[PDB]
Design a protein around this ligand. Structure first.
Ligand SMILES: [Fe+3]
Lengths: 315, 272, 189, 49, 49
């Protein structure tokens, strides 16, 4: 550190930031010189490790959207709704495998990193590059129609193996590419996978089951600790100033209906009970199922779910 | 629209805001997952969330407490970890709905107690101004001494001329020593208090057990006293009439009764 | 029967409100959980297992429970006096750099001789290879072709006190049982 | 109202009438002399029952 | 607020429009969302004669 500066000389050091260290970067580097007040260069940030394991797609991956809405109704069949969480918490459930060079890496990562923030790639949003990406290029031209890409987010290229990967920061979406702030330091040709990245944490440590000397199947579940912004759109049809659900439910699994009532106060003693209708109104309950078979339908369904906000918004 | 949203059956988006204020310093927190800007004030989002237990107004101060739950790393609560701040932290609670710029005031009070049951949480008990009515109100005794704290509204003595600003020479576990006070007679500062600036326009005060020569004895220890910070030290009044007039010449305002009567009734047994 | 493993943690105080939760690591340590099964096919083995169960006294008495994985594989021969074992880069340095749990090694040579070592510190050397260190010596020069597995060791104790010994045929016959071991911080620290 | 902001009303507390007092004695102090004085308030309707 | 009178009506219970005065208050703005009030019938008045 002690080294003279020549007059009219600018010495640009190379601040190399490693990958191993404490999670919270709380650094205060002091540039102290004689006859000058201390000029402390403060470096702040956080250290994260990305999840670089590909789960097999034999079993369907379950994505869960959960929100909180505590509703209280009076004696009459009238409901007031108090939707609590504006951004629903997203949970992912999937199964994976590890045989060659991934089992030991997975075990080490789980033992070391444990219950700490990850960088979970969005497996359902897999994407294949159409043209090779030159090393050092700024911007990845790829489809962004109905994808979980947000301005100032993260992206993670991947290769055949776990090691082949690299994470970059996306500035904005141009509807055809991903504006980047830092150039890519390694070129991957056509075939490399592109994954949107969202912060996630291990809700429960997976229970590893040994298949052979070096083989373990895990049921990993992840929860995202970042709001998932998404447009909220209702069905086009409108009736009495309200949305109308025109989608025809799938009949693959037989569905039934019921007439739920506030039929409490049965007042059963020993001789005979007697039920009184507090409101004398029946609120039907209906089930619904659907099949996407397309990106547009899935995006529309996600927008509908976000617009519903649980039980708050009716239709 | 706040009232309209409350009456609305489908736009309910409750969000509770807390404002901790101590003079010129304010701490803003919100219970949502994103920061909220209100009245040009942005409320930070606490990782883990901040939530209360409810508001009770039953007329009983002992029972109508307000409880706040927050992580153990909360900035405002962190101050109480070592020693309670001298001043009380006023707390104001607002209620607003996301997307609306109007909020309603719900609770107003000050910090009553703080504890850290778990490393991942902290519980704060907030008390209202009604609880300050449980202490007695006699505040009157026919004794010889002054029965008035030097500088109170009853003594009417200005302590600003007696203010002494100094930098301590050495600080120990229980004794703070300075040579400037060594020039005063023993016991000159006895009964006084030391105030110094902590942050902004807020000062922390400490009383003095005794003053002897160049050494000052601080009640409860000297922990939290900066070793090089500027300190303001005021004298103390013993309360005796001779002490009151010789030192401060405040005899006309002397609230004590030195020699009016000790026992003499007018319905006794024998006057002689 | 296929068996799995998990990393149990004292990850409480999630502190979920309405906006977003936040999980804090009280200790920042992972204690693995391992399952075990065995077959007797003999009186001596069953007697030994009963003696082991009695010695365990539930979760009280601990004992090392080596895994049987192949996490580490050699990529360069190591001299007998060398303490610079070279292994394929699996992110060990960034994750495992010396701490209780996942810092013990069993060489388990082809012949049958097994060496127990103690990791001291791991340093990154290349994107594909590392130079993880050991405590003292190896015993001889072993080429990569003469290593079967590594099977990270870890101190563990029983997770459930109750043990079911399923007698099938007879004292001089086959038997089945299941045991589960969980990591615990013990051995004077 | 149930449709105007009332959820549920549980307690009724019908009360009783046969109980409760029929005569009430009020004691007060007259500041002219400071001597204890009292007045009597009667409930004829309840008293008869 | 405490002491504030207001009207309550509930036809199913057979209670007509009644004037009551607020008593103990316990509200829960966040979480359960339960606002529970204890009220008494309005019978307080100080005659001038
Ligand atoms: Fe005085």
């Amino acid at each position: 550190p002690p080294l003279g500066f020549a007059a009219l000389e600018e010495r640009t050091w190379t601040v190399s930031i490693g990958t191993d260290g404490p999670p919270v970067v709380n650094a205060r580097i002091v540039w102290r010189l004689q006859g000058e007040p201390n000029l402390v260069l403060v470096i702040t940030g956080n250290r994260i490790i990305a999840w670089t394991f590909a789960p097999d797609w034999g079993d369907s991956i379950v994505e869960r959207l959960s929100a909180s809405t505590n509703i209280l109704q009076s004696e009459s069949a009238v409901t007031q709704r108090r939707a609590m969480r504006l951004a629903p918490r997203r949970e992912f459930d999937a199964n994976m495998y590890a045989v060659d060079r991934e089992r030991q890496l997975l075990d080490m990562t789980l033992f070391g990193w444990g219950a700490r923030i990850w960088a979970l790639p969005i497996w359902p949003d897999i994407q294949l590059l159409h043209q090779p990406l030159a090393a050092g290029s700024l911007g990845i031209p790829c489809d962004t129609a109905g994808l979980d890409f947000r301005d100032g987010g993260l992206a993670m290229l991947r290769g055949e193996d776990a090691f082949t990967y690299e994470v970059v920061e996306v500035k904005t979406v141009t509807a055809s590419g991903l504006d980047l702030v830092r150039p890519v330091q390694a070129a991957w040709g056509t075939g490399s996978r592109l994954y949107p990245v969202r912060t996630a944490q291990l809700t429960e440590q997976p229970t590893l089951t040994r298949l052979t000397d070096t083989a373990q199947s895990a049921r990993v579940s992840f929860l995202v600790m970042e709001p998932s912004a998404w447009p909220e759109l209702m069905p086009a049809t409108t009736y009495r100033g309200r949305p109308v659900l025109e989608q025809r439910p799938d009949e693959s699994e037989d569905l039934t209906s019921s007439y739920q009532r506030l039929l409490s106060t049965l007042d059963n003693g020993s001789a005979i009970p007697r039920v009184t209708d507090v409101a004398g109104m029946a609120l039907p309950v209906i089930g619904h199922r659907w099949i996407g078979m397309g990106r547009a339908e899935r995006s529309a369904f996600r927008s509908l779910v976000y617009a519903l906000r649980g039980q708050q918004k009716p239709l | 629209s706040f009232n309209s949203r409350e009456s609305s059956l489908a736009d309910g988006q409750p969000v509770r805001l807390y404002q901790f204020s101590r003079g010129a310093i304010r701490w803003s927190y919100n219970s949502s997952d994103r920061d909220i800007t209100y009245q040009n004030q942005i409320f930070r989002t606490v990782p883990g969330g901040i939530t209360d237990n409810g508001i009770i107004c039953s007329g009983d101060p002992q029972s109508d407490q307000f409880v706040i739950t927050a992580p153990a790393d909360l900035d405002v609560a962190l101050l109480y970890k070592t020693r309670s701040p001298s001043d009380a932290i006023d707390l104001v609670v607002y209620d607003m709905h996301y997307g609306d710029a109007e909020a309603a005031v719900s609770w107003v009070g000050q910090i009553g107690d703080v504890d850290w049951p778990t490393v991942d949480s902290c519980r704060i008990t907030c008390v209202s101004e009604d609880e300050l009515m449980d202490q007695p109100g006699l505040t009157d005794t026919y004794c010889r001494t002054c029965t008035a704290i030097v500088g109170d509204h009853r003594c009417k003595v200005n302590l600003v001329p007696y203010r002494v600003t100094l930098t301590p020479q050495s600080v120990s576990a229980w004794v703070i020593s300075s040579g400037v006070v060594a020039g005063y007679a023993d016991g000159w500062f006895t009964g006084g208090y030391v105030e110094w600036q902590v942050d902004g326009d807020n000062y922390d005060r400490r009383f003095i057990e005794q003053h002897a020569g160049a050494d000052l004895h601080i009640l409860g220890g000297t922990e939290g006293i900066p070793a090089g910070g500027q300190l303001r030290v005021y004298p103390g009044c013993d309360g005796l009439a001779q002490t009151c007039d010789d030192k401060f010449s405040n005899l006309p305002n002397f609230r004590g009764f030195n020699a009016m009567q000790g026992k003499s009734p007018f319905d006794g047994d024998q006057v002689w | 029967e296929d068996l799995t493993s998990s990393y149990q943690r004292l990850l409480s105080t999630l502190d979920n409100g309405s906006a977003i939760p936040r999980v804090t690591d009280v200790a920042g340590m992972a204690l693995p959980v391992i399952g075990h099964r065995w077959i007797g096919m003999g009186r001596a083995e069953r007697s030994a297992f009963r003696s082991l169960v009695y010695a365990l006294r539930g979760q009280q008495k601990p004992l090392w429970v080596p895994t049987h994985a192949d996490d580490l594989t050699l990529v360069a021969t190591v001299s007998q006096l060398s303490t610079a074992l070279d292994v394929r880069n699996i992110g060990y340095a960034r994750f495992a750099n010396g701490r209780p749990g996942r810092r013990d090694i069993r060489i388990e040579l082809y012949d049958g001789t097994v060496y127990h070592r103690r990791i001291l510190t791991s340093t990154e050397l290349d994107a594909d290879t590392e130079r993880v260190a050991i405590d003292a010596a190896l015993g001889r020069l072993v080429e990569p072709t003469d290593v079967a597995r590594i099977c990270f060791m870890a101190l563990c104790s029983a997770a459930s006190d109750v043990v079911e010994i399923e007698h099938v045929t007879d004292s001089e016959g086959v038997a089945t049982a299941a045991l589960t071991f969980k990591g615990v911080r013990d051995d004077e620290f | 109202d149930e449709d105007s902001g009332l959820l549920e009303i549980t307690q009724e507390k019908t009360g009783s009438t046969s109980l409760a007092p029929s005569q009430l004695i009020v004691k007060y102090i007259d500041q002219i002399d400071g001597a204890q004085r009292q007045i009597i308030v009667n409930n004829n309707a309840v008293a008869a029952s | 607020n405490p002491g504030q009178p207001f009207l309550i009506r509930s036809t199913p219970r057979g209670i007509p429009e009644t004037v009551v005065r607020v008593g103990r208050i316990e509200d829960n703005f966040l979480g359960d969302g339960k606002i529970t009030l204890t009220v008494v019938q309005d019978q307080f008045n100080l005659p001038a004669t």
